[PDB]
Design a binder for this molecule. Structure first.
Ligand code: SGN
Ligand code: CA
Length: 494
């Protein structure tokens, strides 16, 4: 009678690249099936928009200052409480397959197979895995391999125990190497630009101006844009693009070279400069990012079809999300980290027909700390008091409606600075209609956005007289929220 769980999570996917979220860029039919047969959350947020921290928050139901894992230079204390351990005590068989990114050996999993290359980022081709204590190499393409490993786990499971499987893809993380069948697929496709692709940061503070995550300056010609021929790579085999290209089979290298020849010729013509060059880089980025997404959605389909074939689709809570969202050129950026909406907001779609009316939507403000208590609640396990999120069951079971007692803000705290991409440390709250942010290291600057009037977050209204009352109310809610979640020294002074 207890439901199975499959928790499907990508790395750096985002709502703009999902058709169920009204995106124009790509159709995602299998993700959309989950939404159309289930519920779509419009206001689910990561509490620290970085991979390792998000994964730690998901396992523990706790904010980063409680779970210990504040940045991608942390090691997860595996002795702490996590939902898979609790499910395993309750009689579930548990599995972890794909991107782990928590460094310590997984605990609470009957079976685990985790990407070990690139310091646990994984490789796209011929990925290394650490699997139940041993190193292996899997031939092929990661997005497909991870799905085959998931199916193999399910085929070989103890069919007298319910299962909980965490299925964690590498795609679509940088540097966006598509599957062989998708190489070159968007070479003749032009994607619409966001209206703020050329953002000059008027109306923002120092943090937006001082980042290093731009289309214009940060994307590299080799690793990101793929602008080397085979001949060029073979002359310098220490090249980082070559380090990942060389993992592809010969026939895939041939297809890659054919797929990128046009792009290389366009770059070598030497006529692209300034805004035109930024626009061209944007197209190349989107073509690679979106081509990489295609295999993710195909593989979700394979899992949905497998579950249906074995008669377990309706008896399984099916979740799809991404560790955080991602900038697809908005504000001129790629990457995450900021509390801005594109990357703070996680996709969250859930199918479970017993509980969830098909085609439901929710605006209930939800966080990645809510996943753990939701799974424990549906598994009939008492939710321990130290979990900081809340079960989503009351939302799920009432067509997505927001309970009267539901929280009024999502809380956010990002720590990783100085570091890659140079995003200042900050914390804040997102209410239904507003956002309040404090950047506190190595600047001291507040920002505030009216999300209904300014959904693209272009106009910092902090300190503007007409918002004085609202600003005070948001300050007060921020302080209450910090106290509630025990973030007692949020500026890290003591
Ligand atoms: O040149 S790369 O090495 O590709 N650079 C990427 C960054 O662009 C990315 O922000 C981090 C963290 O990403 S996370 O999703 O793991 O948090 O991972 C790598 O270091
Ligand atoms: Ca990520």
């Amino acid at each position: 009678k207890r439901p199975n769980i499959i928790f499907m999570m990508t790395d750096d996917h985002t709502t703009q690249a999902m058709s169920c979220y009204g995106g124009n860029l790509i159709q995602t039919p299998n993700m959309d099936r989950i939404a159309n047969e289930g519920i779509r959350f419009d206001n689910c947020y990561a509490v620290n928009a970085l991979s390792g921290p998000s994964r730690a928050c998901i396992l523990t139901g706790k904010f980063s200052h409680e779970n210990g894992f504040t940045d991608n230079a942390s090691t997860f204390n595996g002795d702490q409480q996590t939902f898979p351990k609790l499910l395993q005590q309750a009689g579930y068989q548990t599995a972890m397959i794909g991107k782990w990114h928590l460094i310590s050996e997984p605990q609470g999993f009957d079976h685990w197979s985790i990407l070990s290359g690139q310091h646990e980022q994984g490789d796209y081709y011929d990925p290394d895995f650490w699997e139940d204590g041993k190193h292996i190499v899997e031939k092929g393409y990661a997005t497909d391999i991870i799905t085959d490993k998931a199916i193999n786990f399910l085929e070989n499971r103890d069919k007298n125990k319910p299962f909980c499987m965490m299925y964690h893809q590498k795609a679509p993380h940088r540097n966006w190497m598509p599957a062989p069948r998708h190489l070159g697929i968007f070479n003749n496709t032009i994607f619409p630009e966001p209206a703020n692709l050329f953002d000059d940061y008027e109306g923002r503070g120092k943090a937006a101006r001082e980042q290093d995550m731009s289309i214009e300056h940060t994307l590299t010609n080799d690793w990101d844009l793929k602008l080397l021929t085979r001949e060029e790579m073979l002359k310098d085999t220490t090249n980082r693009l070559y380090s990942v290209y060389k993992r592809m089979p010969s026939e895939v290298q041939d297809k890659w070279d054919s797929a990128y020849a046009q792009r290389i010729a366009e770059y070598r013509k030497g006529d692209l400069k300034g805004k035109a060059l930024i626009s061209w880089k944007y197209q190349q980025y989107m073509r690679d990012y979106l081509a990489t997404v295609l295999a993710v959605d195909e593989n979700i389909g394979r899992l949905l079809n497998y579950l249906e074939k074995i008669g377990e689709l309706d008896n399984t809570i099916i979740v799809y999300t991404s560790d955080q969202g991602f900038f697809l050129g908005e504000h001129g950026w790629f990457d995450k980290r900021f509390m801005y909406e594109e990357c703070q907001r996680m996709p969250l779609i859930i199918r479970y027909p017993k509980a969830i009316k098909a085609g439901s939507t929710s605006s209930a403000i939800s966080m990645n700390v809510d996943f753990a208590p939701t799974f424990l609640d549906f598994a009939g396990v008492e939710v321990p008091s130290d979990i900081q999120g809340a079960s989503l069951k009351p939302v799920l079971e009432n067509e997505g409606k927001t309970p009267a007692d539901w929280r009024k803000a999502a809380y956010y705290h990002y720590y990783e600075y100085p570091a890659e991409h140079s995003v200042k440390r900050h914390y804040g709250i997102r209410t239904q209609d507003f956002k309040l942010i404090h950047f506190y290291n190595d600047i001291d600057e507040w920002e505030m956005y009216d999300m209904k009037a300014d959904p693209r977050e272009m106009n910092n209204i902090f300190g503007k007289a007409e918002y004085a009352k609202k600003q005070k109310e948001l300050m007060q809610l921020l302080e209450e929220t910090q106290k509630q979640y025990k973030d007692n020294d949020p500026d890290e002074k003591e």
